[PDB]
Amino acid sequence: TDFQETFKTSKRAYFAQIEKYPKLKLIDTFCFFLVLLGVIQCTFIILIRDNFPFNAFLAGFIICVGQFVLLMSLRLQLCNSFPGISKNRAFAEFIVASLILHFVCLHFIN
Amino acid sequence: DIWLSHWASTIQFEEYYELTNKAAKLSKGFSRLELMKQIQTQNMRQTHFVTVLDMLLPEGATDHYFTDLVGLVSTSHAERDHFFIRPRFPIFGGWNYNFTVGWTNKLSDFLHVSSGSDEKFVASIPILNGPPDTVYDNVELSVFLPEGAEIFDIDSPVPFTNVSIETQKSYFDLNKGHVKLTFSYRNLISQVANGQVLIKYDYPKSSFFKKPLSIACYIFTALMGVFVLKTLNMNV
Ligand SMILES: *[C@@H]1O[C@H](CO)[C@@H](O[C@@H]2O[C@H](CO)[C@@H](O[C@@H]3O[C@H](CO)[C@@H](O)[C@H](O)[C@@H]3O)[C@H](O)[C@H]2NC(C)=O)[C@H](O)[C@H]1NC(C)=O
Ligand SMILES: *[C@@H]1O[C@H](CO)[C@@H](O[C@@H]2O[C@H](CO)[C@@H](O)[C@H](O)[C@H]2NC(C)=O)[C@H](O)[C@H]1NC(C)=O
């Protein structure tokens, strides 16, 4: 019950799943560096003591959380496609969602 | 503001009065008890304040209204040839009251087709209608000809201070709009200045039918706009 089969087995399924499809490589490494930007901003708020604008922090933070959200919501539609939604309609909706999130996060940075 | 209309064959008067009572002001303020007892004692002889106004209108007037700034007033009585008015508060000495009246006459007795050309009209407008005992410190008479009218000649019996020709867009004025011919008279008396303003203009049938054809142009370009937005392929 040491769960040694879990991380190795899911490591084989996921790590085999990456290089079989070249676009999921783009999606999950871009998700990973979005997590690095969230960690860099969060340790900027920890390293100093104040969050002085506090709309700049939630601007630069909710653009990374929201963009990670939209990337997972596209990866789930490319790995196993939804019934009424094509793979090309899986991507234009991501574009429109990402442009709306970029507008609201450039309005919220002031 | 008057509004000539060839499609409805009607002329539509609307007047905005800003009247003061320049009589003597009343000491000890105003008390409704002394006013109401003064009504209940006898007969309402001749006194200072304003309770009713008698508006002398043209002969056949149809749709009477009397509004303030804040809403309409229901205390008005439009009998034949005479439009009686009760304001909300009685206008004592020095008090202000700004109101608006309006009515609707047919156009067949204010407008006359000329003889040389069929599409040339001559209008004679009553310069002043109001209560019988009023003095007018400023009058601006705006007559509004329809959208394709072109004014040739202008005559007034009373010497005005100013005159100008502009345009103003009313309902369904898709093009430039109504022709606002506005006079500015300074000092007038209700009883004395008996006059009519004479406008000679033209209004050809080329511009008479451009109103339903202009609204037809907007409906047509809206529906061809619907056609472009339904023959267009957007399917990713
Ligand atoms: C109803 O109509 C009356 C009559 O035109 C309006 O009264 C006028 O109001 C203006 C601005 O309130 C007055 O101008 C003022 O002049 C004095 C000096 O005379 C100056 O101290 C003020 O700063 C201002 O410029 C004007 O005198 C006054 N006319 C009369 C005869 O009293 C009234 O405003 C209108 N009310 C509404 C609600 O539309
Ligand atoms: C005579 O009437 C004309 C209207 O054409 C007045 O001119 C306008 O005056 C206003 C000031 O309230 C300006 O905003 C407009 O731009 C003017 N328009 C034009 C075309 O000049 C003029 O002031 C009036 N003159 C007098 C002496 O009453």
CA-to-CA distance for B129 and B94, rounded, in angstroms? 23
| CA distance linking residue B117 with residue B106, whole number of Å | 23
Shortest Cα distance, chain A CAs vs residue B232, angstroms: 17
Buried/exposed code over A57-90 (b: 16+ C-beta within 10 A; e: otherwise): bbbbbbbbebbbebbeebbebeeeeeeeeeeeeb
Specify the length of chain B in residues: 236
User: What's the longest Cα–Cα distance across chain B?
Assistant: 88
Atom of ligand 1 nearest to the CA of B18: 2
**SS3 (DSSP) at B182:** strand
Find chain A residues with C-beta within 8 A of B236's C-beta. Answer: 86, 88-89, 91-92
CB B145 within 8 A of CB B181: yes
Rounded to a whole number of angstroms, the distance from the CA of A74 to the nearest CA of chain B is 15
Distance B196 CA to ligand 2 centre (A): 24
Nearest Cα neighbor of B108 from B235, B216, B5, B230 is B5
* Closest by CA position to B53, among listed B84, B16, B94, B89: B84
For tokens 């020709």, what's the residue?
A: B165
Distance CA A89, CA A77 (A): 10
Domain boundaries, chain A: 1-110
CA B215, CA B211: separation in Å to the nearest integer?
6
Is B162 within 8 Å of B205 (Cβ atoms)?
no
SS3 B153: strand
Measured from the alpha carbon of residue B184, the closest ligand is 2
- Please tell me the experimental approach by which this structure was elucidated: cryo-EM
What lies within 8 Å, CB to CB, of B196 at 6+ separation is B124, B125, B126, B127, B157
User: Cβ of B6: how many Cβ atoms within 10 Å?
Assistant: 19
Helix (H) or strand (E) holding B111: strand B111-113
Using alpha carbons only, what angle is made at residue B202 by residues B165 and B4, rounded to the nearest 5 degrees? 65
Number of C-alpha atoms within 13 angstroms, CB side, residue B30?
Answer: 12
CB under 6 Å to ligand 2: residues? Answer: B 162, 164, 184
Ligand 1 pocket, residue B22 CB under 6 Å: no
Q: How far apart are CA B122 and CA B234, in angstroms?
A: 58
Spatial distance between the Cα atoms of A98 and B141, rounded to a whole number of angstroms: 59
- What is the interface size between A and B, counted as CB pairs within 8 Å? 5
Give me the resolution in angstroms, 1 decimal.
Answer: 3.3
- Amino acid B180 reads K
**Cβ-Cβ contacts under 8 Å, B234 against chain A:** none
Collapsed DSSP state (helix, strand, coil) of residue B62: coil
B234 Cα to chain A: minimum distance (Å) = 11
Please tell me if the CB atom of residue B9 comes closer than 6 angstroms to any atom of ligand 1.
no
Residues of chain B in Cβ contact (below 8 Å) with chain A: 236
Residue B224 contacts by C-beta under 8 Å, 6 or more apart in sequence? none
Residue B60: what are its φ and ψ, rounded to 5°?
Answer: -105, 100
